[PDB]
């Protein structure tokens, strides 16, 4: 039994801390409006979604991204209070954060014990998946740029070790044209556009099949493709005949 007037939320049957439907609220003592966003209460930082519900998690304030923690995580903190959390990673569900000396979450590129990570500027959450950053293509897992062949919006790119091609940054997709790539014990072939080819291919008189999901040549034994079984050698070359 509450009402929302002109994007401002009020509850009747009210000011201060209110538990409603299990979810926690703080209606401003003066305006009776439900607090939204970063909110200071008794010198203690809290954070509410746009709907007024208090949150546990990592959210941006005027001093950067803060950790709004469950009860009794640090000192005797109240549920939802921002806490001191220094020089370490935080793992919340499948999200990863790195917290600095001033208990704020890292954003952008950061070097942690000699390893480089990228944390999304808008969430502080460890990057995952294809990303374009200052016109450079990266493919992230758990905040770490991956090396290998991964599928982006324009097909499979070669995300390479530093200085593979004219000083590319570590994990940056590079130009890599009309040639085989032998990488993870895996075999790939790259066309003129620097994308890995998939499917059946004839290259230098030999037949190959590059798996659609990974772009790796079928290699090292028996494979089923199109409902039948083929043998592919150690070099990815299809043997004669079909079983």
């Amino acid at each position: 039994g509450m009402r929302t007037i002109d994007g401002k939320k009020y509850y009747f049957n009210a000011t201060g801390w209110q538990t409603i439907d299990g979810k926690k609220y703080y209606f401003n003592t003066n305006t009776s409006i439900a607090s939204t966003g970063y909110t200071i209460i008794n010198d203690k930082h809290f954070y509410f979604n746009t709907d007024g519900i208090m949150q546990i998690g990592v959210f941006k304030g005027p001093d950067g991204f803060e950790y709004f923690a469950p009860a009794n995580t640090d000192a005797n903190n109240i549920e939802g209070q921002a806490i001191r959390y220094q020089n370490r990673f935080l793992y919340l569900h499948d999200n990863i954060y790195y917290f600095g000396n001033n208990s704020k979450a890292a954003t952008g590129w950061v070097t942690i014990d000699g390893r480089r990570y990228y944390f999304e500027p808008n969430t502080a959450i460890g990057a995952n998946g294809y990303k374009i950053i200052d016109n450079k293509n990266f493919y992230f897992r758990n905040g770490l740029p991956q090396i290998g062949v991964f599928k982006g919006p324009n097909g499979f790119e070669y995300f390479a070790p530093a200085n593979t091609d004219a000083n590319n940054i570590d994990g940056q997709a590079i130009r890599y044209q009309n040639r085989f790539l032998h990488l993870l014990g895996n075999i790939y072939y790259f066309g003129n556009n620097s994308k890995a080819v998939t499917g059946w291919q004839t290259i230098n008189g030999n037949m190959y099949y590059f798996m659609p999901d990974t772009a790796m040549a079928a290699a090292g034994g028996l494979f089923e493709i199109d409902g039948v079984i083929y043998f592919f050698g150690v070099d990815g070359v299809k043997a004669p005949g079909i079983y």
Partner: peptide
């Protein structure tokens, strides 16, 4: 032994 999804190919 193995047999393909269709049943036409075996090893």
């Amino acid at each position: 032994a193995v047999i393909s999804s269709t049943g036409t190919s075996t090893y």
